[PDB]
Curated annotation (Swiss-Prot), chains A, B:
Stored PANTHER family: GLYCOSIDASE FAMILY 31, MYOGENESIS-REGULATING GLYCOSIDASE
Annotated signal sequence range: none
Activity-pH dependence: Optimum pH is 7.0.
Protein name per the record: Alpha-xylosidase
């Protein structure tokens, strides 16, 4: 939102006031309050006929400093509020001197300067990381529209770059962009987002959450080029500065504060196939697809029924279409015998045609206008109404329908929609409609998640969710929505993927082959490789099917190859998943996140790290040309075994069975012995692979159990030309490949054999030692 | 401007129509006209009650394709128009087949698809470089404000980045930003710009000029993330796709098309000092600065008198203040004996207080409101009026005043302001005020330039101009305006400098030490090194002086060292300057422009190429730490002589007499024998420096005469361990340094002496051969 | 109320949608429900992001067919209602074929045509007495006043004349006249009436009661010269076609229905 008109002017009709001078500082228990005047009030003659700002500094968690800046306290201020974990006795330091008032939590402090030169500074052990210069926060009285706003502008240093703000599909680095945090259904092709989060982070190792569920308007270097401005229609502005000092540590604090990604069941990590959207489907079509996958030796783990499992125009009423699915329990029973998991489409809206609509209206379960009539429009469904999830009775009715589907054998739910929530309404609980617009996504998904938790168990709960708001990362599996079948959209989808993990979400999928339009085979092929090298992998389309044989026969080989690889990669991947749940470190990582000190990584958006150790770079061309950057070290292709030196860019050409997938040096990586399913006994039959262990380094590998805890730890320490290998825990029948090592000088405690990938050492105990040539 | 409301919807109150089907194609001489309906009109029943788009394709210059899309032709459409060089006889090809209508100029064609699948593609020898997909152009009937617009969205490929759009201070790469081409006085710290140009170019080697002097609203990957959208309030949209296939080749075409930067006289390349803005100043003050510079052995070449050479509130009446400057012609005559060139501040406004105002009002020389009264406001000067430069008599009056200052010994003018031109007015010539807002900067600067041309001569003409519009690069020296004295603003000014060169402008200055506020000594020192390594170097401040002794002792050594260096680099710099005049390649070049195929260079904005051969990376910290990227090759520090290998980033720490200044391999560079002035006989006493001549390569150095032409060419060709040095033309008493080569085996036809930087050879004639040890 | 602007155009700022294609037919005991889309919804790709009309046919008395055409059902809809004598067990026939959905009470049926050529016809012993041609009913979103209307136009054949609509002092035959059913004290010398009734009958031996006590705006051969248009500010329109086949027989059914 534009406040200034260039450097010298203010937008017409705006009147501004700013905290310009400390008047008084008070400590109230573990919080610091600062009263600041918008003009010089040292003389009693000026200590009247003036506004006064009240600034409160507090800490909800170690290393997070809260800043509340307020004008009038008498405003209404109804919920909902973000589901923040606020601790009550965080240890803090408050120093009030002649020069400064300073509030400190962990290594992070907020310091305000007293006297004639106002400053608000955020320090990390006395070093300035950002802050607000005088006249860069305060109150906007907009006389054009009679609305009042609070705002702040936080400095960006030379070369400081901004990330996050939700799943967005614009350029990855936010500098230069205006961003409104307001859920919409705009597809993946525009400035709009289905999933908005008013949190950003920088390459200087801090983050900021602006604590307002309504629309927050960020001008990220787009109004004042060297500041992040944010404003909100409110009598107060409250935000949290979150210390790092690395992007991963910021996200650790952030997810602790707003919610940890749950750990999805291992099965969800396999291949998902759908019916597609407006295509035809019935039992025969579905069986056709499952069978065709089987006959082509293509592993398939989850099948999803899209919207037309219900009758047209009655969507979300939970009634199977009797002419298309005359035996729903029997069908799902048949499909389950194979070992398939089943998903079905739901949403939080209801079309007027449904016999159930009348029941909901009589019962008062639907979103009403202030006059008591139903809110309705004709987008998505005719005479569409919205389930009011602030009504406990409506929540129960909707939960019950879902339990009914679970009792028939559905394992999970695609929680679609939830974005276009109107504000000209009155919620059952009298919530603020401006805050409910975004927070509805959370309430909706939380409701669904809780149904699964109560029926299949927490360990088995998973969603495929389109919309989100602060906290919703606790309810995993988010997918990038309605992309298009071309390279540009595949690339914009990845930007959204990176962005969502930079916003606290650990798991992310996208429609392989693209949702809208039919891809040429080459595009679908390139996208298969990307999709199976994402945390979650789904084949879904709008008007055409996504089975590989709708494209060409080489496509079946592509799906087969990469599905096998993902299943063999599950021991590494699922440990990486437990890391999202424990530390909020997403599986798909921006390069800047894994290598924060490397200036070459600042703008990388065509490649990513999949967990700690593997760099993936999807190929965005038919001919297979691809350019990617490698950070310092010696990297090894995961299956080609070729080696590349880092700190530079590389250019390659790959066939449809290939893409750059490079393993970090000093790495010990577990691959499993099952390429047919993701959920298996990973610690039995394990093939450990050691990559470029340098002298003086130790590479560690933790093999997880089904619950994500560590069940076996293998470590390899290089001391001179000796490598000592120690195991600890539980593993059977494992193996250790010395990557690009053809010959060895010595070996206590085990036997050797040659492989194409290098020497394979089979242990006798868990106490072997190798001596190199 | 927002047109879509996400992928699926349109902004409320907008009605769109688009060219969706070719109805008829016709060749009109060397132009191709496509009539395109907004619906299916194959049957006669639909060939009525419909709008129709008329698309005209034409070529004003080889490798430029103009596209004009019109709705109504009956609109007024008055001037002014851009000063484009439009040729009538460009050789073109037009092919009308059953599939396509294609128009080709040079290697570049526009191709429209007939039949059901409309497409408009721009092809480089049959390869699609960009294009407009169906429904991504056409007409907007805005029923909210009753205005109509035309728009286009040109595709961006994966990894395609956008540059230019004028001197802008936001992030260098435009993806993600909204840009309005509307001149404003916004300082350097916002989204606003003094110098707007509706031309952009990309890393895919094409450019586009949108041919509308009124406000053009660009959404660069900020409405549709994979497109550049531009719209304009008009019944037609006309734009030009400009072929490369290289950024330099794009600028070569663009500047032949809209205007070549003039070659500034060599003296303007020295050090400029000013009185500063609102400081005190009179003849004694000025003498004290000039003698002050001399006593410290700090070369100074140009002195500038800012606004208070005239009486306060009378600004731009051209009358010396007789209490501050009682003898102007004597003073300047005295100042000139000391060799100095003289600049004075002018602008195109006049305050009411001036006795000349009444004269101008009675003569009708000032801009009027439609009722015949004067347009006035109180910003800048009280009762400020604007000189109406569409009035031929007003132009003459203003030019004669300027001729008066020239006859007094003024050498050049600072053409300040020209941006805040109101639209609620009636121009003497009846021009469209929406078009006059930007074009006024052209007409103003053109007028001042022609005064110089007619008095001192074309080769002696130079300005220091704040605003600009298409074609104004012809009137060089532009400076980046009112920046602030800190690192963030030094950095934002560099983004502006890079961007203006990416928009057609050859020469660019910035206020050394920052304009607003007083820099700490360290910042002034860092900025001095950046300023003296920019095409044009000026010391200028707002409320404080910019003589180095106002900061500290070391600042005088800093100014001295880099002034001496610049004067010595002149043989190389002036040659690079002649390049801006010939090919429109600016002196300060974004890394992407010099290394278009290096993916590491797309986003670099804190370093630049100064000419073909020299990379500079200003230092933006007190302690002197700096990170920079080096393209492939082996680079040598210009004076420290250390070597670094390319294709990677580097980190260094530099003292105040230093920064990264690296010379690429296979370079023969000329330094001169005068460190006291920029204008001297470069081809006598020349010291040539050979850097890392690889086997098989040849290095070429062209020493310029005072008019830019090549007066002497030196070539060094490596065959094996033999390098052949041949000169041609006129040079005297030159030497050749073999950088980092201590000893040689053979030397046929020269002498040799060691130096700290390598063997110095002195030739016997135009032909030496050297045999490496 | 003016909806069309001539044969070819629509009044500025009015947006119209019309029931154009049978999507689904359902019998609900003695009532017939027709779902009708305002566009071609044969393909699933078009079975979303569209309005949908819900038409219900029912009979409150022998020889009277009730037609209720509705857009949104969530509107307030408060009383009072007309004091209608509504029977629950009138004998009716419902036929749902590939070509037609037909609702019949006594000798009077309403028949909607399925497929590409929507038609709403009122039949007496299988002969068309009047009807609604495609695009002559639907919903009006008036963007000028932010009000929404439902409307219908019933055909008039050659020489078919219109009578009634209450105690009115203009020419007895209504063809050519706009009439608003809104009680007023205007004397006897104007277009205004103290006694308004939204019932007309014709010399072809049927009548129609528009079932809305609020202002009903009739254009009787005055906007479309061969139709009686009626429109009401509402999310649904409900009217009754009352068979005769004689004027006295119409009035016999009419007064049995509304009061003797």
């Amino acid at each position: 939102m534009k406040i200034s008109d260039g450097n010298w002017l203010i937008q017409p009709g705006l009147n501004l006031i700013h905290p310009l001078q400390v008047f008084e500082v008070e400590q109230q228990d573990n919080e610091m309050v600062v009263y600041a005047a918008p003009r010089d009030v040292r003389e009693r003659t000026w200590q009247l006929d003036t506004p006064l700002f009240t600034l409160r500094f507090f800490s909800p968690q170690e290393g997070i400093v809260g800043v509340r800046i307020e004008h009038f306290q008498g405003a209404l201020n109804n919920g909902p509020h973000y589901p923040l974990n606020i601790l009550q006795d965080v240890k803090v330091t408050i120093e009030n001197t002649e020069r400064y008032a300073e509030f400190k939590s962990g290594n992070l402090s907020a310091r305000v300067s007293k006297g004639e030169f106002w400053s608000l500074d955020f320090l990390r052990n006395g070093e300035r990381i950002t802050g607000s210069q005088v006249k860069n926060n305060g109150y906007v009285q907009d006389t054009n529209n009679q609305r009042n706003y609070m705002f702040e502008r936080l400095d960006l240093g030379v070369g400081e770059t901004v990330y996050g703000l939700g799943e967005r599909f614009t350029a990855l680095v936010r500098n230069g962009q205006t961003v409104e945090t307001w859920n919409r259904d705009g597809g993946t092709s525009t400035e709009q987002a289905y999933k908005n989060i008013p949190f950003y982070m920088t390459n200087r190792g801090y983050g900021v959450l602006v604590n307002h569920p309504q629309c927050v308007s960020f001008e990220v270097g787009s109004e004042k080029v060297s500041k992040v401005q944010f404003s909100v229609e409110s009598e107060y502005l409250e935000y949290f500065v979150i210390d790092g000092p690395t992007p991963k540590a910021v996200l650790d604090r952030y997810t602790r504060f707003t919610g940890r990604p749950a750990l999805p069941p291992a099965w969800s990590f396999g291949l998902w196939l759908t019916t597609s959207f407006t295509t035809n489907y019935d039992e025969a079509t579905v069986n056709s697809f499952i069978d065709g996958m089987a006959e082509r030796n293509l592993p398939l783990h989850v099948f999803h029924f899209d919207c037309f499992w219900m009758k047209a125009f009655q969507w979300c009423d939970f009634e199977w279409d009797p002419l298309t699915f005359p035996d729903p329990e029997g069908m799902i029973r048949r499909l389950k015998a194979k070992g398939l998991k089943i998903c079905v489409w739901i949403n939080p809206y209801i079309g007027q045609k449904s016999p159930v609509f009348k029941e909901l209206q009589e019962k008062g379960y639907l979103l009403k206008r202030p006059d008591g009539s139903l809110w309705q429009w004709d987008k998505w469904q005719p005479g569409l109404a919205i389930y009011d999830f602030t009504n406990p009775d409506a929540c129960k009715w909707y939960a019950d329908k879902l339990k009914g589907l679970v009792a028939m054998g559905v394992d999970c739910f695609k929680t679609d929609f939830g974005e276009r929530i109107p504000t000209d309404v009155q919620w059952f609980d009298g919530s603020d409609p401006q805050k409910m617009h975004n927070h509805y996504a959370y309430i909706y998904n939380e409701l669904v998640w809780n149904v699964l938790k109560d029926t299949v168990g927490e360990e088995e709960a998973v969603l495929f969710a389109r919309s989100a708001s602060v906290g919703a990362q606790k309810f995993p599996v988010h997918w990038g929505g309605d992309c298009y079948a071309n390279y540009e959209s595949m690339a914009e989808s990845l930007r959204g993927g990176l962005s969502i993990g930079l916003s606290g979400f650990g798991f992310w999928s996208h429609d392989i082959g693209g949702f809208e339009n039919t891809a040429p085979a080459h595009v679908y092929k390139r996208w298969c490789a990307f999709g199976l090298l994402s945390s979650h992998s789904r084949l879904h389309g709008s008007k055409s099917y996504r089975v590989p044989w709708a494209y060409d026969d080489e496509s079946c080989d592509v799906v087969r190859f990469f599905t096998q690889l993902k299943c063999r990669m599950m021991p590494y991947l699922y440990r990486e998943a437990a890391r999202a749940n424990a530390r909020g470190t997403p599986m798909m990582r921006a390069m800047m996140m894994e290598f924060p000190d490397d200036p070459a990584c600042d703008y990388l958006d065509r490649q990513y790290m999949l967990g700690d150790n593997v760099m993936v770079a999807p190929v965005f061309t038919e001919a297979g040309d691809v350019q990617f950057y490698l950070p310092e070290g010696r990297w090894t292709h995961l299956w080609h075994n070729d080696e590349l030196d880092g700190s530079r860019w590389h250019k390659q050409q790959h066939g449809f069975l290939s893409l750059p997938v490079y393993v970090r040096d000093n790495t010990l990586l577990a691959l499993g012995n099952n390429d047919q399913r993701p959920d298996y006994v990973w610690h039995e039959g394990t093939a450990f692979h050691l990559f470029n262990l340098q002298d003086g380094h130790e590479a560690v590998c933790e093999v997880p159990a089904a619950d994500g805890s560590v069940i076996f730890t293998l470590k390899a320490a290089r001391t001179g030309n000796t490598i000592t290998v120690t195991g600890a825990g539980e593993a059977k029948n494992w193996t250790l490949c010395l990557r690009n090592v053809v010959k060895v000088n010595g070996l206590q405690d085990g036997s050797q054999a040659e492989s194409e990938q290098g020497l394979v050492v089979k242990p006798q105990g868990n106490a072997l030692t190798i001596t190199l040539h």
